[PDB]
């Protein structure tokens, strides 16, 4: 008995707000606050990509 | 079978099996479905210990001894390896950070009337 249904404005709107958030808020907050930590400007290339490689 | 005639005051009370009360038949039509009890039946001396809200002796897929062995081994190995890694730390091939004004002497604690030994930094 298939009862699949999501056509409810409440669920769609609530999900889409957090969707826009999880897409853009990281960029906005990262670039819109004063720096508080010393940057890691220079790093080995193999260690620079370790997160992406392991993921 | 009563409790053994020891000093403790159990007296004449049946020693029901230490079998818990969560694992009674969940489909039987109990008189008290939440506690899984029947009206008039003898009550375990430690019912308040086994009420499905507390310790239960439900048989587990893995034996108790092997469960204890595996958990203790994992925790002890983790602690030992954390200590070993503490013995051999990990860092980067760099020298210590350099701060300009006498290692920031005035900004860390102060005491300006003491004239600390001045540390100079080596340009390279």
């Amino acid at each position: 008995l298939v009862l699949i249904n999501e056509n409810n404005p409440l669920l769609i709107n609530s999900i889409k707000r957090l969707l826009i958030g999880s897409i853009f808020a990281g960029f906005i907050i990262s670039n819109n606050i004063p720096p508080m930590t010393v940057p890691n400007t220079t790093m080995p290339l193999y260690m620079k990509m370790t997160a992406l490689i392991v993921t | 079978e009563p409790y053994p005639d020891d000093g403790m005051g159990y007296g004449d009370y049946p020693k029901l099996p230490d079998r818990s009360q969560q694992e009674r038949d969940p489909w039987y039509d109990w008189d008290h479905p939440d506690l899984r009890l029947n009206w008039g039946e003898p009550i375990h001396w430690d019912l308040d210990m086994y009420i499905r809200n507390r310790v239960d002796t439900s048989p587990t897929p893995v034996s108790w001894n092997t469960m204890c062995k595996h958990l203790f081994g994992f925790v002890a190995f983790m602690l030992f390896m954390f200590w070993v890694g503490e013995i051999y730390p990990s860092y980067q091939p760099v020298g210590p950070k350099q701060y300009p004004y006498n290692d920031l002497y005035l900004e860390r604690g102060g005491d300006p009337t003491k004239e600390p030994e001045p540390v100079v930094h080596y340009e390279i």
Partner: protein, 459 residues
């Protein structure tokens, strides 16, 4: 003070000449009116005291206890209104007379500028309580409970009389002002050790201390509702009040004579908190909770630091109100159930929602939730004991965790779950019980706004 003592005395002729169907109304109204009069005493000053006359004086330690004592009586009448329906007029009037006499004795006790008068009324508070317990009690064990309550108290308090008359013979006066101003150190000698023990044991037995608490569960279980609240709320504070009054002459001996009692209390708090977990009875569970809290108060008083005294007073008032509320709720459950067993009636929250709310609030307050005065007193005592020694924090934290555990166990077993099927006499809660719970709880949440009124003279 006579503006308070005289109306309490006039309550007796007022009750005895009332109509047969209007005693409760008159007693409640005039008891509430008396409480309003007692409110004036709360405005203490940073200086010595409100020395009314040569016989009565009021401090900022006596003021909160006096206000609580005067406030409790209307609640006792509303609680006793239920099970005295089928009682003859003369016996109901005798019950109200016993309650009024108890209040009068407590009021005269808490000021009592002289120590011998304090002792006389402190033992006078024992007769109406014993009569109430042994006369209007349901179970057949009320007689043994009354005997235990009488003898445990009297055996401890009898050497106190000898100690007091000896002190009067040597010092020359027992007035508390003179005693405080002319205090001299107690040398380390066997005679002084036994004087210390005599002066302390009489108040430690009533608190009660762990190991001498056997009378309290019996007295609280077998007594009627009003006796239970007057025992848990005010009669337990007599020992602590006396100890904080009398420790002014036992220095510096206490500095090393407090070790056995400190160890006993700091271990008995854990023992009784653990006992509360495995309990088949509600009133017994509440009684053991009271024992744990009073053990904490004992530790605080024996530490003898300003924060200890402030926390002790706050905990005294808070525990009195909370224990009275819990006993009220247990009695309301027992009246419908007629069994007094924790697991016999379950899932009452589905049938009585507002009483479930009252249960939740009372359990949260007992759980020492911030910013209620329960946690204020708790935390003050914790910090003072930490200053005393850094290792006490282990015992105190263990006590806190076990207290939370047994409080929520009491809430969950009686409120949550599926209702018992074979009980069909759970009538909707009356307005009287809801009003009783509201009048119990609202003063606590109001006092959390003005803590300085219950923090004692060392504020």
């Amino acid at each position: 003070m006579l503006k308070i003592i005289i109306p309490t005395t006039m309550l007796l002729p007022m009750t005895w000449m009332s109509k047969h169907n209007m005693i409760w109304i008159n007693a409640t109204v005039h008891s509430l009116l008396i409480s309003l009069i007692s409110l004036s005493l709360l405005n203490q000053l940073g200086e010595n005291s409100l020395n009314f006359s040569l016989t009565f004086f009021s401090d900022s330690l006596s003021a909160p206890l006096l206000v609580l004592t005067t406030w409790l009586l209307p609640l006792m009448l509303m609680a006793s209104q239920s099970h005295l329906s089928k009682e003859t007029t003369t016996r109901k009037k005798l019950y109200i007379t016993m309650l009024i006499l108890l209040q009068l004795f407590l009021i005269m006790t808490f000021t009592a500028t002289e120590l011998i008068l304090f002792y006389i009324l402190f033992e006078a508070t024992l007769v109406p309580t014993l009569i109430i317990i042994t006369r209007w009690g349901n179970q057949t064990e009320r007689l043994n409970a009354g005997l235990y309550f009488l003898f445990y108290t009297l055996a401890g308090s009898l050497p106190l009389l000898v100690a007091l008359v000896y002190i009067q013979n040597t010092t020359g006066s027992l007035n508390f002002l003179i005693i405080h101003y002319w205090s001299h150190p107690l040398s380390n000698s066997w005679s002084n050790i036994f004087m210390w023990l005599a002066c302390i044991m009489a108040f430690m037995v009533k608190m009660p201390l762990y190991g001498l608490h056997l009378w309290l569960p019996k007295a609280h279980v077998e007594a009627p509702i009003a006796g239970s609240m007057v025992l848990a709320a005010v009669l337990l504070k007599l020992g602590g009040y006396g100890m904080m009054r009398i420790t002014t002459i036992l220095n510096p001996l206490t500095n090393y004579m407090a070790y056995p009692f400190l160890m006993l209390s700091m271990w008995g708090m854990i023992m009784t908190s653990s006992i509360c977990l495995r309990q088949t009875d509600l009133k017994s569970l509440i009684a053991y909770s009271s024992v744990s809290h009073m053990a904490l108060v004992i530790v605080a008083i024996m530490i003898q630091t300003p924060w200890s005294f402030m926390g002790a007073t706050a905990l005294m008032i808070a525990h009195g109100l909370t224990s009275s509320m819990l006993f009220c709720l247990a009695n309301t459950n027992y009246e419908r159930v007629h069994s007094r067993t924790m697991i016999l009636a379950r899932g009452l929250q589905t049938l009585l929602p507002l009483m479930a709310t009252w249960w939740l609030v009372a359990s949260l307050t007992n759980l020492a939730l911030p910013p209620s005065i329960n946690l204020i007193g708790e935390l003050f005592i914790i910090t003072a004991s930490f200053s005393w020694s850094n290792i006490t924090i282990i015992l105190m934290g263990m006590n806190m965790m076990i207290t939370a555990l047994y409080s929520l166990y009491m809430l969950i077993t009686t409120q949550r779950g599926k209702y018992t099927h074979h009980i069909n006499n759970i009538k909707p809660s009356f307005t009287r019980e809801n009003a009783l719970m509201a009048l119990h709880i609202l003063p606590l949440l109001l006092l959390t706004l003005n803590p300085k009124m219950i923090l004692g003279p060392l504020y």
